[PDB]
Structure formats: structure tokens, C-alpha cells
Amino acid sequence: REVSDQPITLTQDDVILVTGGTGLFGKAVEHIVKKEQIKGKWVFLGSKDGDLRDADACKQPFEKYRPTYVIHLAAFVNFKVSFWLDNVNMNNNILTCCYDFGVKKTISCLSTCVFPDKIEYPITEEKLHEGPPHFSNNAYAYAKRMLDMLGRWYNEKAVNEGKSCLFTSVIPTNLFGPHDNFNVEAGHVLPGLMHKCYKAQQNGTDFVVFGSGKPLRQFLYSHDAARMLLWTMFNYQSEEPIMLCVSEEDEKSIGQVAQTIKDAFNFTGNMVFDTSKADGQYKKTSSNAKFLRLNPTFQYTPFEQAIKETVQWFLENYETARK
Amino acid sequence: HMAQREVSDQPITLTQDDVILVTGGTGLFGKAVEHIVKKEQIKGKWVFLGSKDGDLRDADACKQPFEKYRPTYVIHLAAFVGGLFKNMNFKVSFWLDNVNMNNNILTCCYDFGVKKTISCLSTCVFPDKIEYPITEEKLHEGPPHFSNNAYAYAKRMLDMLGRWYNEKAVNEGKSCLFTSVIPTNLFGPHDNFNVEAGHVLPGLMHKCYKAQQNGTDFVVFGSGKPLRQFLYSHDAARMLLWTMFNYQSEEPIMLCVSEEDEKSIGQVAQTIKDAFNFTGNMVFDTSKADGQYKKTSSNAKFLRLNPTFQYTPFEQAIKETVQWFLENYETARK
Ligand SMILES: NC(=O)c1ccc[n+]([C@@H]2O[C@H](COP(=O)([O-])OP(=O)(O)OC[C@H]3O[C@@H](n4cnc5c(N)ncnc54)[C@H](OP(=O)(O)O)[C@@H]3O)[C@@H](O)[C@H]2O)c1
Ligand SMILES: NC(=O)c1ccc[n+]([C@@H]2O[C@H](COP(=O)([O-])OP(=O)(O)OC[C@H]3O[C@@H](n4cnc5c(N)ncnc54)[C@H](OP(=O)(O)O)[C@@H]3O)[C@@H](O)[C@H]2O)c1
């Protein structure tokens, strides 16, 4: 079945290798692991630790740390050629090292933006390969598609050779939280609005939002994503990707996001919407039905509570935050 | 982009200064190109690579012929289609061996400034849920069949990588064109005639040869009634060469025969029977289950772009292959 009869129980002898562990998602995983006293030696790799696109450099952390579990979060996010080569080489290397070094379970990370361009909503995991992705990021998208397929192919090989190697994947939708990229120009909508509001509070200016503020998105707190990913590691046995998102009823509009940010900074000035900028797509809804059916009692952090925590982290660490 | 037609106004004319690199030039398709190049005395220095020249899955080894020969054109036919041994045939290998070889070759093509590169797809990589006849535009409209999906996806990503390298060439102002052909079932000399691992038609030839030498019956699996399109490798080589000379579009172009020219599996078996002059019985082992009746691919694009193209009649192409097989059996791939 999709979930093991009993959860995997980590011990002090287990080693968990987390590629791309220094970003938004990795830092949340590290935060939950320490907070919940999850056992094992957790190794959070960054680029400083080695170029995973090179096959030889990629095995060095496997030879060094001898992992029993792998959480594969690294990606390259410039010519489309480079996005294809860099990502497909890294993914091919990591999964191959995971099989060769006898990793018990490997969990990789897909993305909402790799699904078919022509797709009927809500996006469900089963639609991943049902048509070409959008043209605009199709190199990144196809490399993610082939990360999923390579996992299924290594499962076939493991079954054939009697090896105990499991490959699966998760699909987070719009993460936000501490250790995000808060650049107003380059960063994601939610972290950038936090920085714009704070500058409006420090200065005398108005909080300006690009667009009408009406498009609705599903936003997942990074700490929640980490709890969902860890549950997946402990319990989820299927090779099918599992979507990690909030329900549709929990989708906030951009204006709601901006308003929540203002009231978390205790911002008193005016907040205006610049409708010169064209509005993005109105809704791009992902279904959390699978996670809801397999882990029905999961509790999310309410959006307002999550914004207060990120603003609070962002305020306490502004000097050291990525901007 | 609206500017260029699918074909150049005049075909490219090769000179003695041109170097044409053919990866996979020792296999079925490659040897056919080598035969046409020699028969029609095409200009240029032609290099037909094989695995003995270097393992194109390795990035460093792949550079060695490009640094050595500095080609102006590349015909990329090399592919990993199966190993002789089981341990080399997991789906994992079909993905890795092919995607590594394809990434290396197209990257070398770009870095060394090849003017035009033609790679090779296959009609068995198209989506499983599809309406017949198959047209080139349907290549990515859904997942391929499960049984060969690693090979199929590697071919799809060879097509995509070419489109992405065209985008880079346009942006960098380089004059590099990447396109591809999609041949149907090929047959001919220098094929793989192993009955277990080879294609149906060359296997039927080797089977008929064994039946004649041994005294046995010529046994064909299935009823014989499935319809297939079969393209003589020498004809495919001429279509491929026309493509290099004339075709400017990055969209793949199918190389196949018309629907009228589809032969039944029994019809192929009979033609093979009558070309060996085999006088024993031809038997259909209906205990084996045969594939789907029709799997038609469209040749509309090539027929529209090259209407005067002349095919070799099926019977004459079979007799030429059988005669090659009898004269060269000792050195033939089996
Ligand atoms: N955030 C979202 O909303 C979202 C949506 C869909 C999917 N995802 C997926 O979730 C995963 C990461 O989430 P994130 O948002 O936390 O990413 P992130 O914040 O950008 O951090 C990414 C990590 O990847 C590592 N990395 C990148 N290229 C590398 C390379 N060539 N060799 C070695 N390490 C490399 C970085 O190490 P340095 O710190 O040294 O660069 C960093 O630790 C990715 O697979 C991403 O596609 C996220
Ligand atoms: N034959 C068909 O029915 C058919 C139908 C559709 C598409 N195609 C396409 O046509 C192209 C060639 O087909 P084929 O029928 O000619 O295949 P083939 O007869 O099996 O020959 C394949 C070629 O690839 C070369 N090769 C394989 N692995 C290599 C490596 N690692 N490094 C260097 N060279 C390597 C072989 O070299 P050695 O000779 O040294 O092993 C041979 O030259 C392939 O891309 C295939 O998909 C064929």
C-alpha cells in the first residue's frame, strides 16, 4: 500500500544526506529536525560542499558520510541549455549514487511549474506527464520530469536485483518562510512584499503592490512543508509523487497577502495597488487530496500566524537575510 | 519566428573543405549513408565513427573526434539500442546511456560550430494515446508506451536539446542548425540479424536462412496479418541526405512510406521466402500473440517537401538485402 504498516524509526546510526539543504526548504527541515528531536546524523549540503553535476564530485559525500537516507532538494533555478544540462546531470548523478551506495529511501523534490501547460484543474499528481509543460521554463520542467522517471526506473532495477532502495518524490507549492529570498525584484511574490512593506514602514512612503491584488494562490509555510516531507520519509512508500500544498479554501489573494503583511509589521501608512502591471493568471489550484487522505489529521499553521513568524524572523535577521 | 521556409531555396553544395562526422556510422543506417555517399560521389571528407573509435557516452571521449576532424556537418545516428547482456539492459541504462551520448554530441556540435546537425528519432517514441496517422507535431503530446519509455524519453529530450541549442545559437549569433528525422522500420545490409535481439524483418531473414540450411520449416510468430511500414535503409539514407541538403526546420521530419505501401507481416515473410528461393513450408505460430494491427505514421511532410522522390520497390529492396546477407553471412551481425 501507499503507507507502510509501521513508520520507519530513525536511530543514532542513520545518516540523512540533504542536498540543497541551506535554502528555504532545507533550513525548515533542519529547524523541524532539531525542534522535534528527530534522531540521526543530518548532513545539510550546499554548493560549497561540492559540485553535484560532476559525477566524481557527486560521489564524494556518499563515500564520506555513507548515508542511509537521502533528501534530494538541490536544483538549478541564462541559456535554457544550461538549465537542462545542469539539472539532468545533477539528478542523474545523485540518484545513481543513491542506488549504488545502498540508500534505503531517497525523496526528491518536483515543482508545480513542471505540470502540463494544457491541464484541467485541480492539478493532481497523476497528470505530471500528460502533455508538454509551458514553453517558458520547459528545460527546468523536463529535467524535473526526468528526475521523477529516473526514480521509477531505479525502483524497477531495485526490484529486479532484490535491493532495498526506494525512490519517491514530493511536490511543494509556493513555499515561504525564514531564510527565503526577500529581494523585491528577483524574489517570490510573498517574500518580496514583506521587504517592500518594511521599506515603506522605515521610510515615509506608501506600500505599493504590483497588480490588482485579486489573483489567488495557495501558500505553504516552509515549516509545514518540512513536517509533511518528514512524514513522507517515515510513512510514504509509493513511488508516485505526493503534492504538498494547502487546501483550496486556504488560498489567499495577493491583496490578502499584502494586507496580512501590513498588519504584521504594524504598518500604519497607506497601501495602494498599481494596476499598470498586468495581472498574472487568476488561479492555478493544486489538489492536496492525496495527502489529506493519507494523513487526515495533519494540522497547518494558519496563514496569519505564518506571516507573523516570517516577518519576525525577517526583522530579527534583516542584516543577515538574503535581499 | 516566421522568416525561413522549411527548405532552403537551393540545396547546400558541399565542397572538399567540408568535414561530415557521422556518429553511429557503422550500424544499419550509417552504412547505408556511406553507400549512397560513395555511389553518388558526394563531396567532402566523410568520417563514419563506431564505438571502436571512442565511447560517445563519455564527455571527454566525445570531444576527441571533434577536435581531430573539426566537422562542418554532423549526422548523429549513434544510440544505445540494447546490450548483448541482460545487466546492460535495465531501463536505467537506456536512459543514462542515451541521454549522456545525446547531451555530449549536441554540445560538441555547438561548441565546435557545426553548421547543421541531424539527429535521429524513431516512430516508437510517440505518445501511446494517439490518433492514427502519427504526425511529427504529436511527439510530446503525452507519455510514450511503458515498455520502452526510457529509450523513448531519451529520444524526446534529444529533440528538445536541439531546439534549446537553436535558441542559444540565435541569441549568440552563431550559425548552427539542429534538426532531426524520424525513420520508421528500417531494413537492409549490415543490420542486426540476431533472431532474439534483432528487428522483425532481419530476424525473419536469418530464420529463413536457418530453415533452408537445416531443412526445417520457416516459422513466423503471430498470424501474419499486422500491417507495418518498412523503409529500405538505402532509401532512408537518400531521404536523410536530402534533409541535410535542403531542410531548414527544427521540427523533426518523418522518413517512412505511404500508407498504401504498408506490407503485412506475412507479405514480408513471403517476399523473404521467395528471395531465398526457400521451397519448404512457411508456418505461422499463432500460439504467439501479435501486436496491434495498424500503427500508421504519416509521410505527408516529406511527400509535400520532396514530391519527386523515388522509392526502391519492396521486392527489389528485399532481394538486395538477401543477396547481401548470403554473400556476407560470416561477417554479418548475428
Ligand atoms: N520554494 C518553492 O516554492 C518551490 C516550488 C517548487 C519546487 N521547489 C523545489 O524545492 C527544492 C529547493 O527548495 P528551495 O526553494 O529551498 O531552493 P533554494 O532555497 O534555492 O536552495 C536550493 C539549494 O540547492 C543547492 N544547490 C543548487 N545548485 C546546486 C549545485 N549545482 N550543486 C550543489 N548544490 C546546489 C543550494 O546550495 P547553495 O546554498 O550553496 O546554493 C541550496 O542549498 C528545489 O528542488 C526546488 O525546485 C521549491
Ligand atoms: N533500425 C531501425 O529500424 C530504426 C528505426 C527508427 C530509428 N532508428 C535510429 O537510427 C539510428 C541508428 O539506428 P541503427 O539501426 O543504425 O542502429 P545500429 O545498426 O544498432 O548501429 C547503431 C550505431 O550506434 C553506434 N554506437 C552505439 N553505442 C555507441 C557508443 N556508446 N559510442 C559510440 N558509438 C556507439 C554503433 O556502433 P558499433 O557498430 O561500434 O557498435 C553503431 O554504429 C538510432 O538513433 C536509431 O534510433 C533506427
Side-chain angles (χ1 to χ4, degrees), chain A residues 2-4 7-8 10-11 13-33 35-36 38-40 42-47 49-76 79-117 119-125 128-184 186-195 197-204 207-209 211-213 215-248 250-267 269-271 273-276 278-283 285-307 309-317 320-322, chain B residues 2-9 11-37 39-42 44-51 53-62 64-85 88-128 130-136 138-195 197-213 215-224 226-259 261-282 284-287 289-294 296-318 320-322 324-326 328-334:
Chain A
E2 281 155 301
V3 300
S4 52
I8 292 172
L10 256 28
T11 79
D13 301 329
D14 286 304
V15 175
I16 305 88
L17 199 56
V18 184
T19 81
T22 62
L24 168 66
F25 206 178
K27 237 107 186 42
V29 172
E30 177 181 25
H31 171 251
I32 295 304
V33 164
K35 205 237 196 177
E36 294 298 301
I38 299 312
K39 288 149 153 31
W42 289 73
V43 181
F44 293 88
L45 298 175
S47 56
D49 298 300
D51 181 9
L52 305 176
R53 299 170 298 171
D54 179 78
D56 298 320
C58 186
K59 36 201 195 169
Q60 261 154 11
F62 285 82
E63 299 179 353
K64 177 176 170 158
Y65 301 110
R66 307 167 65 78
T68 45
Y69 294 91
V70 163
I71 300 180
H72 172 40
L73 307 175
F76 298 96
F79 299 114
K80 277 187 178 175
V81 165
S82 89
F83 290 148
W84 167 254
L85 297 173
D86 286 355
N87 282 295
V88 77
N89 284 331
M90 167 168 69
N91 295 333
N92 286 345
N93 293 340
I94 286 289
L95 265 52
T96 293
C97 285
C98 287
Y99 186 88
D100 288 352
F101 286 85
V103 177
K104 288 194 182 62
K105 192 193 276 195
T106 295
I107 301 181
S108 295
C109 191
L110 312 182
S111 168
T112 266
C113 55
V114 315
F115 274 81
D117 186 53
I119 193 170
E120 285 161 81
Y121 287 85
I123 297 172
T124 36
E125 298 92 332
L128 177 63
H129 299 278
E130 295 300 321
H134 189 263
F135 166 88
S136 61
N137 243 259
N138 59 2
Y140 174 88
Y142 272 127
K144 287 304 204 185
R145 300 261 191 110
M146 297 309 108
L147 167 60
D148 168 62
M149 290 308 300
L150 187 51
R152 303 172 188 262
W153 294 327
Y154 268 117
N155 288 331
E156 283 185 37
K157 186 180 185 173
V159 163
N160 238 262
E161 295 196 324
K163 198 161 193 179
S164 287
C165 287
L166 185 42
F167 295 84
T168 184
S169 67
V170 301
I171 315 181
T173 89
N174 308 289
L175 301 188
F176 69 95
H179 298 280
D180 210 341
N181 180 0
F182 295 88
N183 181 269
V184 287
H188 295 326
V189 192
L190 195 157
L193 284 179
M194 267 179 199
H195 202 186
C197 185
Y198 189 45
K199 305 210 276 208
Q201 181 165 91
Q202 281 312 292
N203 306 307
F207 183 19
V208 170
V209 185
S212 67
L216 313 141
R217 294 293 185 272
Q218 278 154 321
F219 294 101
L220 185 61
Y221 192 31
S222 67
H223 293 182
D224 293 354
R227 289 189 290 125
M228 305 166 84
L229 172 61
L230 288 168
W231 176 93
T232 295
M233 177 176 71
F234 297 154
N235 297 280
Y236 185 69
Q237 250 170 352
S238 165
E239 79 180 351
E240 305 294 323
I242 181 173
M243 191 95 60
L244 310 187
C245 65
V246 299
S247 75
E248 194 190 355
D250 289 330
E251 76 194 347
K252 305 302 178 187
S253 87
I254 295 302
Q256 282 175 304
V257 175
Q259 175 63 17
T260 314
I261 280 172
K262 152 196 207 174
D263 299 1
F265 276 102
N266 270 330
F267 184 76
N270 290 29
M271 159 165 134
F273 288 94
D274 194 45
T275 155
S276 324
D279 269 6
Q281 198 198 357
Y282 179 77
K283 265 181 64 156
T285 301
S286 339
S287 163
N288 74 328
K290 188 193 290 174
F291 188 97
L292 176 59
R293 155 174 72 79
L294 294 183
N295 193 7
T297 63
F298 184 86
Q299 197 190 333
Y300 293 90
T301 304
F303 179 72
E304 298 77 346
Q305 173 71 31
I307 290 296
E309 282 173 39
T310 306
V311 165
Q312 180 176 8
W313 180 91
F314 181 63
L315 290 170
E316 297 173 22
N317 297 285
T320 74
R322 349 214 320 267
Chain B
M2 286 279 133
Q4 306 291 307
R5 292 192 300 112
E6 288 156 302
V7 297
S8 50
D9 277 1
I12 293 188
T13 75
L14 281 53
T15 90
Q16 296 312 344
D17 274 316
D18 286 309
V19 185
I20 305 89
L21 199 59
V22 182
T23 79
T26 61
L28 170 66
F29 205 174
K31 295 296 275 187
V33 172
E34 180 184 28
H35 174 251
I36 295 306
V37 157
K39 176 186 183 177
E40 298 184 350
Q41 281 298 285
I42 307 204
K45 179 183 183 192
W46 289 74
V47 182
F48 293 87
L49 299 175
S51 56
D53 296 300
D55 179 6
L56 304 174
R57 293 168 292 176
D58 179 83
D60 302 323
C62 190
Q64 185 273 335
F66 284 79
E67 301 187 17
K68 175 142 177 273
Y69 299 109
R70 302 293 172 120
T72 53
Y73 293 94
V74 167
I75 302 181
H76 171 40
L77 307 176
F80 172 75
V81 299
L84 311 139
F85 308 94
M88 312 170 166
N89 297 329
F90 289 107
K91 280 187 179 175
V92 161
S93 284
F94 280 94
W95 171 253
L96 299 177
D97 290 358
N98 281 298
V99 80
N100 283 328
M101 161 165 25
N102 290 334
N103 291 345
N104 296 343
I105 291 290
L106 268 55
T107 295
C108 282
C109 286
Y110 191 77
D111 290 352
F112 284 83
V114 175
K115 297 179 166 66
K116 193 193 278 191
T117 292
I118 303 185
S119 296
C120 196
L121 314 185
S122 116
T123 67
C124 65
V125 315
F126 276 83
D128 189 51
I130 197 168
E131 297 256 82
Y132 286 98
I134 300 170
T135 46
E136 295 90 333
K138 294 163 149 179
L139 177 60
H140 303 280
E141 299 301 320
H145 189 265
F146 166 80
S147 62
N148 66 335
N149 60 4
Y151 177 86
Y153 273 126
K155 289 303 202 185
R156 297 194 180 190
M157 295 308 108
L158 164 57
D159 168 63
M160 289 308 302
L161 183 52
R163 303 173 186 263
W164 295 327
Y165 267 128
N166 289 332
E167 285 183 39
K168 185 179 183 172
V170 169
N171 285 295
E172 244 154 84
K174 279 185 109 150
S175 290
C176 291
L177 181 54
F178 291 80
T179 185
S180 68
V181 301
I182 316 184
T184 200
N185 309 286
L186 300 188
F187 67 98
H190 299 280
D191 209 338
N192 182 0
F193 297 91
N194 183 272
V195 304
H199 299 326
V200 166
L201 198 157
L204 284 180
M205 283 183 183
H206 196 186
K207 245 131 116 36
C208 190
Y209 179 94
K210 289 172 187 192
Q212 184 168 58
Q213 176 114 34
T216 71
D217 286 1
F218 183 21
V219 182
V220 187
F221 291 157
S223 61
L227 292 165
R228 293 304 178 258
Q229 278 153 324
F230 294 99
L231 184 59
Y232 190 30
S233 65
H234 293 180
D235 290 351
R238 290 191 290 123
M239 304 167 83
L240 173 61
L241 289 171
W242 175 93
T243 297
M244 176 182 70
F245 293 153
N246 298 283
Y247 190 67
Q248 286 176 332
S249 165
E250 76 178 348
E251 306 297 327
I253 179 174
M254 282 214 266
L255 309 187
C256 68
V257 303
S258 74
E259 187 168 338
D261 290 333
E262 70 197 350
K263 298 307 197 265
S264 87
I265 274 167
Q267 272 180 300
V268 172
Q270 183 64 31
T271 313
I272 291 175
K273 175 184 165 156
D274 297 326
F276 273 104
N277 293 316
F278 179 73
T279 75
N281 308 320
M282 184 175 72
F284 300 100
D285 172 24
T286 46
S287 99
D290 43 71
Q292 75 179 307
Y293 180 56
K294 274 168 71 68
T296 301
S297 48
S298 163
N299 75 326
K301 179 139 78 171
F302 189 93
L303 175 74
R304 158 177 73 78
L305 287 185
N306 192 4
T308 64
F309 183 84
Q310 298 284 46
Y311 293 109
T312 304
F314 181 66
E315 298 69 16
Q316 175 190 334
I318 289 296
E320 284 180 6
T321 304
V322 168
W324 179 92
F325 189 53
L326 292 167
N328 292 284
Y329 182 76
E330 178 190 341
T331 59
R333 289 166 66 202
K334 36 187 166 311

Short mmCIF file of all heavy atoms in Angstrom, two decimals, chain B residues 52 55 75 79 141 146 166 175 183-184 193 216-217 222 224 245 274 276 279 293-294, unseen atoms left out:
data_model
loop_
_atom_site.label_atom_id
_atom_site.label_comp_id
_atom_site.label_asym_id
_atom_site.label_seq_id
_atom_site.Cartn_x
_atom_site.Cartn_y
_atom_site.Cartn_z
N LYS B 52 34.39 1.56 -31.61
CA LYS B 52 35.83 1.33 -31.55
C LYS B 52 36.60 2.64 -31.61
O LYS B 52 37.72 2.73 -31.08
CB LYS B 52 36.29 0.38 -32.67
N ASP B 55 33.97 5.84 -26.97
CA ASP B 55 32.68 5.69 -26.31
C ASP B 55 32.02 7.06 -26.15
O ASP B 55 32.39 7.84 -25.26
CB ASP B 55 32.90 4.99 -24.97
CG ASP B 55 31.60 4.81 -24.15
OD1 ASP B 55 30.48 5.11 -24.64
OD2 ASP B 55 31.71 4.37 -22.98
N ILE B 75 26.00 14.15 -38.78
CA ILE B 75 24.84 13.27 -38.82
C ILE B 75 24.95 12.37 -37.60
O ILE B 75 25.87 11.55 -37.51
CB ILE B 75 24.76 12.44 -40.11
CG1 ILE B 75 24.74 13.35 -41.34
CG2 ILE B 75 23.52 11.55 -40.08
CD1 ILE B 75 24.63 12.58 -42.62
N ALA B 79 23.23 5.52 -31.08
CA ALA B 79 22.29 5.36 -29.99
C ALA B 79 22.58 4.04 -29.30
O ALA B 79 23.14 3.12 -29.89
CB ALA B 79 20.84 5.37 -30.48
N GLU B 141 2.93 15.03 -26.99
CA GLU B 141 1.56 15.19 -26.51
C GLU B 141 1.14 13.97 -25.69
O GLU B 141 0.16 13.29 -25.98
CB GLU B 141 0.62 15.40 -27.69
CG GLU B 141 0.94 16.66 -28.50
CD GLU B 141 0.87 17.95 -27.69
OE1 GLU B 141 -0.03 18.10 -26.84
OE2 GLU B 141 1.76 18.81 -27.88
N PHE B 146 4.78 2.23 -22.10
CA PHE B 146 5.56 1.87 -20.92
C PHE B 146 6.78 1.01 -21.27
O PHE B 146 7.85 1.18 -20.68
CB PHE B 146 4.63 1.14 -19.94
CG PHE B 146 5.34 0.43 -18.84
CD1 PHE B 146 5.81 1.13 -17.74
CD2 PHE B 146 5.52 -0.95 -18.90
CE1 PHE B 146 6.46 0.47 -16.71
CE2 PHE B 146 6.18 -1.61 -17.87
CZ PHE B 146 6.64 -0.90 -16.78
N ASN B 166 19.26 25.55 -30.71
CA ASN B 166 18.90 26.56 -31.71
C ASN B 166 18.63 27.90 -31.05
O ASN B 166 19.09 28.94 -31.54
CB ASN B 166 17.69 26.11 -32.54
CG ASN B 166 18.02 24.93 -33.50
OD1 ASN B 166 19.16 24.78 -33.96
ND2 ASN B 166 17.01 24.11 -33.81
N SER B 175 25.76 30.42 -36.35
CA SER B 175 25.04 29.81 -37.46
C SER B 175 25.08 28.29 -37.26
O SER B 175 25.90 27.57 -37.84
CB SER B 175 25.63 30.22 -38.80
OG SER B 175 25.36 31.59 -39.07
N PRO B 183 12.84 8.06 -38.70
CA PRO B 183 12.65 6.93 -39.61
C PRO B 183 11.71 5.91 -38.99
O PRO B 183 11.57 5.81 -37.77
CB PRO B 183 14.06 6.38 -39.81
CG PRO B 183 14.81 6.79 -38.60
CD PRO B 183 14.18 8.07 -38.10
N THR B 184 11.01 5.22 -39.86
CA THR B 184 10.15 4.10 -39.50
C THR B 184 11.02 2.83 -39.43
O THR B 184 12.23 2.91 -39.21
CB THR B 184 9.02 3.98 -40.52
OG1 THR B 184 7.95 3.22 -39.97
CG2 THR B 184 9.53 3.33 -41.86
N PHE B 193 21.03 -9.24 -37.35
CA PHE B 193 20.20 -10.36 -37.75
C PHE B 193 20.01 -11.41 -36.66
O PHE B 193 19.57 -12.52 -36.97
CB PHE B 193 20.78 -11.01 -39.00
CG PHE B 193 20.79 -10.11 -40.18
CD1 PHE B 193 21.89 -9.31 -40.44
CD2 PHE B 193 19.72 -10.06 -41.03
CE1 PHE B 193 21.93 -8.48 -41.53
CE2 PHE B 193 19.74 -9.22 -42.13
CZ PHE B 193 20.86 -8.44 -42.39
N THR B 216 14.41 -27.33 -42.14
CA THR B 216 13.28 -27.15 -41.25
C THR B 216 12.20 -26.31 -41.92
O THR B 216 12.25 -26.01 -43.12
CB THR B 216 13.75 -26.52 -39.95
OG1 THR B 216 14.12 -25.15 -40.18
CG2 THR B 216 14.96 -27.26 -39.43
N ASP B 217 11.18 -25.97 -41.15
CA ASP B 217 10.13 -25.08 -41.59
C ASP B 217 10.51 -23.65 -41.24
O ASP B 217 11.22 -23.39 -40.26
CB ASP B 217 8.79 -25.44 -40.94
CG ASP B 217 8.17 -26.69 -41.54
OD1 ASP B 217 8.78 -27.30 -42.45
OD2 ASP B 217 7.06 -27.05 -41.10
N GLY B 222 3.14 -15.08 -34.64
CA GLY B 222 1.89 -14.40 -34.91
C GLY B 222 1.18 -14.93 -36.14
O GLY B 222 1.63 -15.84 -36.84
N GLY B 224 0.44 -13.13 -38.83
CA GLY B 224 0.95 -12.60 -40.07
C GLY B 224 0.16 -11.42 -40.58
O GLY B 224 0.57 -10.80 -41.57
N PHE B 245 20.73 18.47 -47.05
CA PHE B 245 20.97 19.44 -48.11
C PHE B 245 19.94 20.56 -48.13
O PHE B 245 20.27 21.67 -48.56
CB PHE B 245 20.97 18.75 -49.47
CG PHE B 245 22.10 17.78 -49.67
CD1 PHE B 245 21.96 16.71 -50.53
CD2 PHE B 245 23.30 17.94 -49.01
CE1 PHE B 245 23.00 15.81 -50.73
CE2 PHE B 245 24.34 17.06 -49.21
CZ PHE B 245 24.19 15.99 -50.05
N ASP B 274 10.53 -16.03 -50.98
CA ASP B 274 10.80 -16.12 -52.41
C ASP B 274 12.11 -15.47 -52.83
O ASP B 274 12.53 -15.68 -53.97
CB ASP B 274 9.67 -15.46 -53.20
CG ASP B 274 8.35 -16.15 -53.01
OD1 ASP B 274 8.34 -17.39 -52.86
OD2 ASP B 274 7.31 -15.45 -53.03
N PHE B 276 15.07 -15.95 -50.93
CA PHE B 276 16.00 -17.03 -50.64
C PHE B 276 15.78 -18.23 -51.55
O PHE B 276 16.65 -19.11 -51.59
CB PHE B 276 15.84 -17.47 -49.19
CG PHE B 276 16.66 -16.68 -48.22
CD1 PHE B 276 16.07 -15.71 -47.41
CD2 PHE B 276 18.02 -16.91 -48.10
CE1 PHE B 276 16.82 -14.99 -46.51
CE2 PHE B 276 18.78 -16.20 -47.19
CZ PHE B 276 18.18 -15.23 -46.39
N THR B 279 11.99 -23.41 -50.51
CA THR B 279 10.93 -24.27 -51.04
C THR B 279 10.19 -25.06 -49.96
O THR B 279 9.26 -25.81 -50.28
CB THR B 279 11.51 -25.26 -52.08
OG1 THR B 279 12.26 -26.32 -51.44
CG2 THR B 279 12.40 -24.54 -53.08
N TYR B 293 -2.83 -4.23 -35.02
CA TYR B 293 -2.98 -4.42 -36.45
C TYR B 293 -2.29 -3.31 -37.25
O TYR B 293 -1.48 -3.60 -38.14
CB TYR B 293 -4.47 -4.51 -36.77
CG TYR B 293 -4.82 -4.72 -38.22
CD1 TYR B 293 -4.32 -5.80 -38.95
CD2 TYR B 293 -5.69 -3.85 -38.86
CE1 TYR B 293 -4.66 -5.98 -40.28
CE2 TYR B 293 -6.04 -4.02 -40.18
CZ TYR B 293 -5.53 -5.08 -40.88
OH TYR B 293 -5.91 -5.20 -42.19
N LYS B 294 -2.59 -2.04 -36.94
CA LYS B 294 -2.04 -0.90 -37.66
C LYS B 294 -1.38 0.09 -36.71
O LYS B 294 -1.87 0.33 -35.60
CB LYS B 294 -3.14 -0.19 -38.49
CG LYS B 294 -3.38 -0.79 -39.89
CD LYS B 294 -4.66 -0.26 -40.57
CE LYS B 294 -4.54 1.19 -41.02
NZ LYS B 294 -3.57 1.38 -42.14
#
